[PDB]
């Protein structure tokens, strides 16, 4: 789904079809470089998504003082310290699942058990 660029000249590659050999050949519209396509997938709309609750993590989230602290442990390092905080996505239907990030194992883990 990614947007490849011509290695000779960093420009947006477009799909165009072979006339007789029946293959998608990503030809550059700037220069004459051409490349066959790995998959017949071209375009993808994705009208439904549920993604974005997790990321935005820096390696020193716990360096900020404002995050609360708890005593549930990381289930890799067993250290009782932690940093917990809710979803990083905000829709009007995002969940009350929580995200728990530790400093010792430096790992993200949740509290869902379904």
């Amino acid at each position: 789904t990614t947007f490849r660029f011509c290695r000779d000249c960093n420009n947006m590659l477009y799909p165009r079809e072979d006339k007789e050999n029946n293959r998608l050949l990503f030809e550059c519209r700037t220069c004459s470089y051409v490349e066959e396509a790995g998959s017949p997938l071209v375009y993808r709309h994705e009208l439904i998504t549920n993604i974005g609750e997790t990321a935005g993590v820096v390696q020193d989230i716990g360096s900020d003082p404002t995050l609360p602290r708890s005593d549930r442990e990381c289930p890799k390092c067993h250290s009782r310290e932690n940093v917990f905080f809710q979803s990083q996505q905000r829709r009007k239907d995002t969940s009350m699942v929580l995200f728990f990030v530790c400093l010792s194992c430096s790992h993200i883990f949740t509290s869902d058990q379904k």
Partner: protein, 243 residues
Amino acid sequence: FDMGGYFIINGSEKVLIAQERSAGNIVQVFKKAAPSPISHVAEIRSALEKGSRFISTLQVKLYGRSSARTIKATLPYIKQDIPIVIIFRALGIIPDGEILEHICYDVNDWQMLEMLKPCVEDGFVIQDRETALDFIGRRGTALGIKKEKRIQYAKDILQKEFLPHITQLEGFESRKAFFLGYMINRLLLCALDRKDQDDRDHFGKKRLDLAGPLLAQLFKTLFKKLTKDIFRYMQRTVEEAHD
């Protein structure tokens, strides 16, 4: 006990009150209502202490809700809502992936790239800066020694008037490109709902002015009235004398 910062005009104690406004030169986004053809917008106010009031509004508008995924922008003195790949090429970023690197930051995410792919297809036709700058945006004044629109005139617009912060002199188009890319980034975050709608009613995004700025404004404007009267009677002294 009369600690009081007032003024004494005509035998009357007289005080001025603070005025407020939104802070200028700071990013906001709005979510306009569904039935309009615009959905997500942005704004920058401006003031540079404060020659000819330096208003210079800006907006970037967004179309459809669907298949009308396009991003046009408006600038003075352009009456047409200009698509933005034209602006990137005109400011001097030709290769397409570098416009994409100006806009987004993590190449691994892709939702912005499908957001921008119809806009690149809008910008598929014009492949040169002065050809992009050749788009008219007439709005006055009359053409000088031109052909249709002077590229010198368009570059004079982009230097002198647009974005009256980071520079207005001659040579910082890459700072302009980065600033616009950050603006497009935050607009796309508001459109894709990873980040939320901003608030107008928060306090720190407002400012409070006082007697300093008020006397500054009125003193500047009456000083300009003064200076135009100084230029008056200098043409009138065709005859004597230097009074």
